[PDB]
């Protein structure tokens, strides 16, 4: 008995992180990955600093001393083989503690910044050591682009699974078709906390709006009329952090929210704030509203609140998925 | 099902031969559409006859492009030799037609060996065909071939067991595809 | 079997240039089989178009690789059959667009239409395959191999016929065709 699972969703929604979690839970190369973690660290710092002068209004440094470090960073930005001298980590760490640089980080939804930013910048001292050994949470946070189709095999209770990872960016979608045939189920991953951001491909179309469109385009596809989709509302942690902060309002992007109220059948996690519950469920209903409109009886949709970089959550959620595949004899 | 049933199957270890006429577009400009077809019928009839003898399965005719394969549908270890022997008979047949007719018919022959997918596509008007990079290459061997000579790749030579004497084809310098893909060509004597 | 000559047949070579690029051979797509599955879909939707009553006179001759070849006038003031061949081209594009919306692609069609006298029948000895021969077919193909994406390239004589029927054309200029030489071509306006 083998299950062919396919992972879909827009770019940077956390698909590759899910497959990684399968490796950790159900299935050496670390030294090869260190080079990648360092790139993310560099990429993150040079992006924040470069956007400070291009915002409206522009953000000003809290220390004129730092202007010199800023110049350094920009000077070594587009360098091919960067050897990462010990000065680089010092300069990086200094800027990261500057208020001007930090306030610019607050308004990061206005430009393009990787998700593992704050995580890597908070542990520069740890990464600078030449005897650095990447933890498992480090390997999960590390961001790298996917170009092509990758097959991952594994077993759970003597049961076989074949996971397929694909690139979510527009140009990498033309390859998806090569998996549509003979697929047990689809896993549509969405970035729940990306309601205030725009896609990299054009710097205009709303991230979540792109997620909704792509999902509707997948749900009503001509070659997937009998293929059930397991919906992963990923990035729940960042969503809460945003909702509670109160700076970026949801009803300022999606006006329909002002009319939405929490359902009676809602299951809030213990201690969870009403506001968080209401937001996380609002996004769920937006995706269900689309799936509910058609395909009656043929195939089904199963929502899930997810946080990919959380092995604990993933272990639980994938166990709920193994159930769906068996109950419905997929 | 959401995908139309596909009528295709894979086959490893097979040989593909291509044959095309020189200046065919130019030739069709001189003689009548009626006469031209006769010279083509005279030529392709003999071709089809020799194919059955040499255990080669004819695929289809794309105007002046004739192509057949050996090793289908039933496997055979004699496959490479069959296609070589095929061209041997073809090249000779072309001479006869050119002699008994007067028309200037000359053809290039191309051969390569490997795996291919075969079957039919669509709903209306089925016609057995083949597809694969190995087929694309065989087609390019014909383009980079030489008039009245058999052009073959290194992969085909390995299935010949050293029976026919060959020589450097320099196919790399005649066709960009052969060069860009690092191919070693050879010619028959 | 038996062959036959004609006077006014309209040949068309509709190609999909970008497919060769899209075709790959890997361990995931099953040695390029998955790609060939999509092509199968495309040819299918093009084939079922022949059932539409407006295309009663269209005769699919075959498919070369990923190039769809068909003709009109084989069932025969009277030039409308040429215009119909154009109408069939617009239809194929409507069908290829639908495939794009569902496969997440951007495939575009290149057409080449010409008309004139041809020969029709079977040849060889193996199979009973109907096909057509003549200079008209040779030139039609060139009108496609030297064409532009999203355009319908037609020869001069065809251009006049299409204009009498109510169509509009645009000179592409003089291009040296292989074996033919300097031919003046045109593009159809939509
Ligand atoms: N905080 C947080 N970060 C997450 C979560 N899921 C994914 N990420 C992070 O988001 C980033 C993008 O994830 P990734 O898996 O690379 O996207 P992707 O969908 O595979 O991207 P692509 O290859 O289509 S371009 C990574 O840095 C990853 O760690 C989550 O639940 N919480
Ligand atoms: N029924 C038919 N089906 C398909 N193609 C046909 C055809 N009838 C004619 N053709 C086309 O007729 C043309 C002949 O091939 P070259 O263009 S190879 O002509 P060349 O002058 O011999 O060139 P050389 O190979 O360099 O010497 C192709 O376009 C065929 O598709
Ligand atoms: C469909 C894919 C692919 C790659 C498969 C293949 O081998 C071909 O079908 C051959 C080589 C092959 O089928 C032999 C006939 C012919 C007519 C020579 C084909 C075309 O050149 C195809 O490309 C075109 C341009 O239609 C090509 C190359 O397309
Ligand atoms: Cl997303
Ligand atoms: Mg990825
Ligand atoms: Mg030819
Ligand atoms: Mn030729």
mmCIF file with all atom_site columns, C-alpha atoms and ligand atoms in Angstrom, chain B residues 20-27 40 61-65 106 108 142-143, chain C residues 13 61-62 64 69 130-135 137-142 145 178-179, ligand 2:
data_model
loop_
_atom_site.group_PDB
_atom_site.id
_atom_site.type_symbol
_atom_site.label_atom_id
_atom_site.label_alt_id
_atom_site.label_comp_id
_atom_site.label_asym_id
_atom_site.label_entity_id
_atom_site.label_seq_id
_atom_site.pdbx_PDB_ins_code
_atom_site.Cartn_x
_atom_site.Cartn_y
_atom_site.Cartn_z
_atom_site.occupancy
_atom_site.B_iso_or_equiv
_atom_site.pdbx_formal_charge
_atom_site.auth_seq_id
_atom_site.auth_comp_id
_atom_site.auth_asym_id
_atom_site.auth_atom_id
_atom_site.pdbx_PDB_model_num
ATOM   1  C CA  . UNK B 1 20  ? 15.465 12.342 -46.052 1.00 0.00 ? 20  UNK B CA  1
ATOM   2  C CA  . UNK B 1 21  ? 15.703 13.622 -49.650 1.00 0.00 ? 21  UNK B CA  1
ATOM   3  C CA  . UNK B 1 22  ? 18.040 16.491 -50.641 1.00 0.00 ? 22  UNK B CA  1
ATOM   4  C CA  . UNK B 1 23  ? 16.497 19.623 -52.129 1.00 0.00 ? 23  UNK B CA  1
ATOM   5  C CA  . UNK B 1 24  ? 13.005 18.136 -52.080 1.00 0.00 ? 24  UNK B CA  1
ATOM   6  C CA  . UNK B 1 25  ? 11.264 21.524 -51.804 1.00 0.00 ? 25  UNK B CA  1
ATOM   7  C CA  . UNK B 1 26  ? 13.384 22.576 -54.773 1.00 0.00 ? 26  UNK B CA  1
ATOM   8  C CA  . UNK B 1 27  ? 12.537 19.405 -56.729 1.00 0.00 ? 27  UNK B CA  1
ATOM   9  C CA  . UNK B 1 40  ? 8.089  9.018  -54.403 1.00 0.00 ? 40  UNK B CA  1
ATOM   10 C CA  . UNK B 1 61  ? 6.333  9.263  -44.043 1.00 0.00 ? 61  UNK B CA  1
ATOM   11 C CA  . UNK B 1 62  ? 6.668  12.995 -43.391 1.00 0.00 ? 62  UNK B CA  1
ATOM   12 C CA  . UNK B 1 63  ? 6.715  14.115 -47.003 1.00 0.00 ? 63  UNK B CA  1
ATOM   13 C CA  . UNK B 1 64  ? 10.205 13.106 -48.089 1.00 0.00 ? 64  UNK B CA  1
ATOM   14 C CA  . UNK B 1 65  ? 11.288 11.909 -44.627 1.00 0.00 ? 65  UNK B CA  1
ATOM   15 C CA  . UNK B 1 106 ? 19.616 11.506 -53.174 1.00 0.00 ? 106 UNK B CA  1
ATOM   16 C CA  . UNK B 1 108 ? 20.978 10.995 -46.196 1.00 0.00 ? 108 UNK B CA  1
ATOM   17 C CA  . UNK B 1 142 ? 19.994 12.545 -40.614 1.00 0.00 ? 142 UNK B CA  1
ATOM   18 C CA  . UNK B 1 143 ? 20.422 16.320 -40.761 1.00 0.00 ? 143 UNK B CA  1
ATOM   19 C CA  . UNK C 2 13  ? 0.374  23.702 -40.254 1.00 0.00 ? 13  UNK C CA  1
ATOM   20 C CA  . UNK C 2 61  ? -4.530 14.799 -42.057 1.00 0.00 ? 61  UNK C CA  1
ATOM   21 C CA  . UNK C 2 62  ? -2.265 13.948 -39.082 1.00 0.00 ? 62  UNK C CA  1
ATOM   22 C CA  . UNK C 2 64  ? 3.722  15.679 -36.845 1.00 0.00 ? 64  UNK C CA  1
ATOM   23 C CA  . UNK C 2 69  ? -1.795 19.510 -39.905 1.00 0.00 ? 69  UNK C CA  1
ATOM   24 C CA  . UNK C 2 130 ? -4.340 8.966  -46.402 1.00 0.00 ? 130 UNK C CA  1
ATOM   25 C CA  . UNK C 2 131 ? -2.009 11.876 -47.071 1.00 0.00 ? 131 UNK C CA  1
ATOM   26 C CA  . UNK C 2 132 ? -1.595 14.788 -49.483 1.00 0.00 ? 132 UNK C CA  1
ATOM   27 C CA  . UNK C 2 133 ? 1.340  15.882 -51.657 1.00 0.00 ? 133 UNK C CA  1
ATOM   28 C CA  . UNK C 2 134 ? 2.295  18.883 -53.742 1.00 0.00 ? 134 UNK C CA  1
ATOM   29 C CA  . UNK C 2 135 ? 4.156  22.205 -53.739 1.00 0.00 ? 135 UNK C CA  1
ATOM   30 C CA  . UNK C 2 137 ? 1.964  21.545 -48.907 1.00 0.00 ? 137 UNK C CA  1
ATOM   31 C CA  . UNK C 2 138 ? 5.699  22.324 -49.036 1.00 0.00 ? 138 UNK C CA  1
ATOM   32 C CA  . UNK C 2 139 ? 5.054  26.079 -49.060 1.00 0.00 ? 139 UNK C CA  1
ATOM   33 C CA  . UNK C 2 140 ? 2.347  25.805 -46.372 1.00 0.00 ? 140 UNK C CA  1
ATOM   34 C CA  . UNK C 2 141 ? 4.916  24.237 -44.035 1.00 0.00 ? 141 UNK C CA  1
ATOM   35 C CA  . UNK C 2 142 ? 7.415  27.018 -44.698 1.00 0.00 ? 142 UNK C CA  1
ATOM   36 C CA  . UNK C 2 145 ? 8.452  27.220 -39.862 1.00 0.00 ? 145 UNK C CA  1
ATOM   37 C CA  . UNK C 2 178 ? 14.528 27.325 -48.457 1.00 0.00 ? 178 UNK C CA  1
ATOM   38 C CA  . UNK C 2 179 ? 14.411 26.023 -52.023 1.00 0.00 ? 179 UNK C CA  1
HETATM 39 N N1  . LIG D 3 .   ? 2.317  15.141 -46.399 1.00 0.00 ? 2   LIG D N1  1
HETATM 40 C C1  . LIG D 3 .   ? 3.301  15.756 -45.753 1.00 0.00 ? 2   LIG D C1  1
HETATM 41 N N2  . LIG D 3 .   ? 3.358  15.649 -44.414 1.00 0.00 ? 2   LIG D N2  1
HETATM 42 C C2  . LIG D 3 .   ? 4.321  16.291 -43.770 1.00 0.00 ? 2   LIG D C2  1
HETATM 43 N N3  . LIG D 3 .   ? 5.283  17.053 -44.252 1.00 0.00 ? 2   LIG D N3  1
HETATM 44 C C3  . LIG D 3 .   ? 5.213  17.131 -45.592 1.00 0.00 ? 2   LIG D C3  1
HETATM 45 C C4  . LIG D 3 .   ? 4.275  16.519 -46.392 1.00 0.00 ? 2   LIG D C4  1
HETATM 46 N N4  . LIG D 3 .   ? 4.499  16.809 -47.729 1.00 0.00 ? 2   LIG D N4  1
HETATM 47 C C5  . LIG D 3 .   ? 5.547  17.590 -47.712 1.00 0.00 ? 2   LIG D C5  1
HETATM 48 N N5  . LIG D 3 .   ? 6.015  17.864 -46.448 1.00 0.00 ? 2   LIG D N5  1
HETATM 49 C C6  . LIG D 3 .   ? 7.082  18.810 -46.081 1.00 0.00 ? 2   LIG D C6  1
HETATM 50 O O1  . LIG D 3 .   ? 8.017  18.987 -47.138 1.00 0.00 ? 2   LIG D O1  1
HETATM 51 C C7  . LIG D 3 .   ? 9.287  19.468 -46.578 1.00 0.00 ? 2   LIG D C7  1
HETATM 52 C C8  . LIG D 3 .   ? 10.490 18.701 -47.127 1.00 0.00 ? 2   LIG D C8  1
HETATM 53 O O2  . LIG D 3 .   ? 11.597 18.748 -46.198 1.00 0.00 ? 2   LIG D O2  1
HETATM 54 P P1  . LIG D 3 .   ? 12.788 19.810 -46.258 1.00 0.00 ? 2   LIG D P1  1
HETATM 55 O O3  . LIG D 3 .   ? 12.303 21.122 -45.782 1.00 0.00 ? 2   LIG D O3  1
HETATM 56 S S1  . LIG D 3 .   ? 13.695 18.609 -45.172 1.00 0.00 ? 2   LIG D S1  1
HETATM 57 O O4  . LIG D 3 .   ? 13.216 19.948 -47.676 1.00 0.00 ? 2   LIG D O4  1
HETATM 58 P P2  . LIG D 3 .   ? 14.511 19.819 -48.424 1.00 0.00 ? 2   LIG D P2  1
HETATM 59 O O5  . LIG D 3 .   ? 14.530 20.876 -49.456 1.00 0.00 ? 2   LIG D O5  1
HETATM 60 O O6  . LIG D 3 .   ? 14.646 18.396 -48.851 1.00 0.00 ? 2   LIG D O6  1
HETATM 61 O O7  . LIG D 3 .   ? 15.615 20.101 -47.459 1.00 0.00 ? 2   LIG D O7  1
HETATM 62 P P3  . LIG D 3 .   ? 16.809 19.244 -47.162 1.00 0.00 ? 2   LIG D P3  1
HETATM 63 O O8  . LIG D 3 .   ? 16.396 18.210 -46.179 1.00 0.00 ? 2   LIG D O8  1
HETATM 64 O O9  . LIG D 3 .   ? 17.807 20.138 -46.516 1.00 0.00 ? 2   LIG D O9  1
HETATM 65 O O10 . LIG D 3 .   ? 17.389 18.814 -48.449 1.00 0.00 ? 2   LIG D O10 1
HETATM 66 C C9  . LIG D 3 .   ? 9.077  19.461 -45.073 1.00 0.00 ? 2   LIG D C9  1
HETATM 67 O O11 . LIG D 3 .   ? 8.674  20.785 -44.721 1.00 0.00 ? 2   LIG D O11 1
HETATM 68 C C10 . LIG D 3 .   ? 7.946  18.445 -44.896 1.00 0.00 ? 2   LIG D C10 1
HETATM 69 O O12 . LIG D 3 .   ? 7.180  18.614 -43.720 1.00 0.00 ? 2   LIG D O12 1
#
